[PDB]
């Protein structure tokens, strides 16, 4: 059936594929390696922003945060420009979602506080919505470099999809803060060739990508059918065995998204 | 296999759906009511141009054709504007494909000459390409309103797909004339909500639409995978039971195109 | 001076140009041969529909009208298809506006009744909105062939623009009937290369074209600025020197429309 | 008389507008603050690509360039995705023009070599084409935030228009290399709401945008009339008085482009 093409796509792209689509009232749940651990990568920035939103008032977005030149460690296209000006929490939220700003993510983790620079506070927030599997242990860019098989900084397509469903479609945030998260994901600039490229243009797509070593390429997304029916699509992939320097294949994520669209149509 | 979704689409739209995709080297052929007769409607204008292209040298496209106001007996968005100046054979080809100009099609049939105002000459050209099923018996706009069950002005998704394959992908025309047909189909303006709306934007789509009474809506097309693999997609549909004035449902054709796209990925 | 470009366009196209744009609160009125008589041609079909709407209830649109093949005298892409079934008043309104159906216009004129097949009743309707200049004396297609200098079947850009302003922007019709006129004019299919081709795509354009002998080409339209400010643009032209068979030049109307857009910007 | 509308637009938008259109054989040059200095912003990426093309054979476009995470110090929608794989010189040209990739621009400046990371080499190339005014002193993103009144990283509408004319319309590049520059500018994705939005759709538009702080918004472009006559349109604007955080107003550039189109018609 459909689980055979996923294995076919795995051969043609030499990767390990993970797909989960939560079941709705009208459709059944799509699963393929759904409960196998994949690396969070940049996709954790999606619940991270929601974590800052959940515990703090809206005025917290206007707090100005200053940082130094030693604080930049990974790709940070926005943090590099404001070393003298500083950035507000809201600007750090925009950078972490739409541009995958690594340094902005580290500062938002620090805003959560606690041990591990906010990693313990973040996974603790992950447990509050019922995710007892995911875990964040390092910061950027260390979380992208974990060896295969290591359980640190990992989630699963099943686990990450249900969190995103509660955050965008559920009641994990008041409408209030919920529309801020959704709007940042709608104007994302880093995922044009992934799940968005696999769905027809008349489908609305909001997403948050993830990319790391060992050919790791992820994309969590919420799509809307042309009639307005929403779905949650979690697509993760790595190429463990091809080495640390294995190139990630975005086409595999886009090809799998077309397979999912064929079923939901 | 895929034929369960197609039947689950016929009930939702109160229509009869026909789908055929010729098999390539790596994939099998998709069929659903593939050998059932559907009305040609305006889709015959695509091989009609190929018949005029095939029978004449390239310089024949510069021949000026004159017509009167009585020749405008159907929707003719381009021929209606040049009644005083006349239009060349090449302009008649452009209008019949990109705008589905009914009057332009009738003049091109006259250019083929012969009995039935060129209908016998057109069906003969279809027989030369191996099409032993299709038949054109009337002109515009009579060909659209044949009663259900009548075999006049009908083809089948199997027959029309194999005809289109020889014209675009095969060698039924020399390269110079073949590129003229493909470009006219690429710049079509009437199929934005059919097969084009069912495939992702990174797939190239050239098509020719057809629409008539009894909720008739067809779309023949050639699609190109993002890597460059070509496919032929014939989608035809009617709702004859709903009556002469039944609206055609373009969403059904776009939804079926998304189901097919999921398989070709 | 904008009136120099209009005379420059007249020299470059070998034509006589007429332009009138009613003055709004913020802009001055554009005039060029504004009070010179030009042939109505198909542009009279816009106030003709308003005449049937104004004098008759909405239920009158469902009345079925029967006609014979001898009643088809002018370009009639829709009346030719429904000669056996007949057409309702509402369909005759649709045909007369979106496709410039000549036969549908004659049948709508007959619906106004009176002497001259409804021409005297129609000009009487023009007098009710304050237009003491325009006059319709013949039917289709005779009104398109009046010799130059003849005052029959003529209007002026000044007169026709102020009439159109009352019908779309004014209170000449109640809201329920006004929306029917605007919707047919918005989905017009015969004016894509005239006023529409001269304004940028972010401007909304509704129009009704006219074309006749002696190189007659007209276009009356209501445009909306990207911010929502409405304007009325009347553009008419003929080439009463190139002879009876002189080709009309659509580019002249489109070029003049870009000149007007430059002033309203 | 066009400079009065430009002055009204400056008051309407709280901005300073600069417009220059080089004179052709039949038309005179349009000027408004044509010799006043405006900030280059991203518009320098167009002649920068031409400088790299000019100094190297076509095979140099295949040279692979590698970079680190610190090379991403600005918005780089393409360079952020290929930091692991590296990008050839040709992709850097595509990214710097079609996506305004800041990091791709910095790498191309480095390919020119010399003092100042290639800025001195770039300004030298402008002097070879006769540009005695422009000057590039910094890299991205420092060049976008020079204080008002500072002459660094500035050009003029007069100077930038003549440079673009030599590169697209002149002989500053051989035909094989000229078509590469022209094709990249035709497929631009960042200028849909500027000069392109001010010209009618039947005009061909290739452009390169620029945006920075102090409300800086630029668009240099080459437009083609529907008959095929080309024009060069340089439109620059800033709102320095409103401060560093002043919003740029794209509508002003699109509105001014509509004023120019009315004159060139």
UniProtKB/TrEMBL annotation, chains A, B, C, D:
Location within or outside the cell: Periplasm; Secreted
InterPro entries in alphabetical order: Beta-lactam/transpept-like (IPR012338), Beta-lactam_cat (IPR045155), Beta-lactam_class-A (IPR000871), Beta-lactam_class-A_AS (IPR023650)
Presence of keyword Mitochondrion: no
GO biological process: beta-lactam antibiotic catabolic process; response to antibiotic
GO annotation, cellular component aspect: extracellular region; periplasmic space
Any one GO molecular function term: beta-lactamase activity
Keyword set, alphabetical order: Antibiotic resistance, Hydrolase, Periplasm, Secreted, Signal
Chief subcellular location: periplasm
Oligomer status and interactors: Monomer.
Homology family: Belongs to the class-A beta-lactamase family.
Name of this chain's protein: Beta-lactamase
Record organism: Mycobacterium tuberculosis
């Amino acid at each position: 059936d459909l689980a055979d093409r996923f294995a076919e796509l795995e051969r043609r792209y030499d990767a390990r594929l993970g797909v989960y689509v939560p079941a709705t009232g009208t459709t059944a749940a799509i699963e393929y390696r759904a409960d196998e651990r994949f690396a969070f990568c940049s996709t954790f920035k999606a619940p991270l922003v929601a974590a800052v939103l959940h515990q703090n008032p809206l005025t917290h977005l206007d707090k100005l945060i200053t940082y130094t030149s030693d604080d930049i460690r990974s790709i940070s296209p926005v943090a590099q420009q404001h070393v003298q000006t500083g950035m507000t929490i809201g600007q750090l939220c925009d950078a972490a979602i739409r541009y995958s700003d690594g340094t902005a993510a580290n500062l938002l983790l620090a805003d959560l506080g606690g041990p591990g620079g906010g990693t313990a506070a973040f996974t603790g927030y992950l447990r509050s919505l019922g995710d007892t599997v995911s875990r964040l242990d390092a910061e950027e860019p260390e979380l992208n470099r974990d060896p295969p098989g290591d359980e640190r900084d990992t989630t699963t397509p099943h686990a990450i999809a249900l969190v995103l469903q509660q955050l965008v479609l559920g009641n994990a945030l008041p409408p209030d803060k919920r529309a801020l998260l959704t709007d940042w994901m709608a104007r994302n600039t880093t995922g044009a060739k992934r799940i968005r490229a696999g769905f027809p243009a008349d489908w609305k797509v909001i997403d948050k990508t993830g990319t790391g070593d060992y050919g790791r390429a992820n994309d969590i997304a919420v799509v809307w059918s042309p009639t307005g029916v929403p779905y949650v699509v979690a697509v993760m992939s790595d190429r463990a065995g091809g080495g640390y320097d294995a190139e990630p294949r975005e086409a595999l994520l886009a090809e799998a998204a077309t397979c999912v669209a064929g079923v939901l149509a």
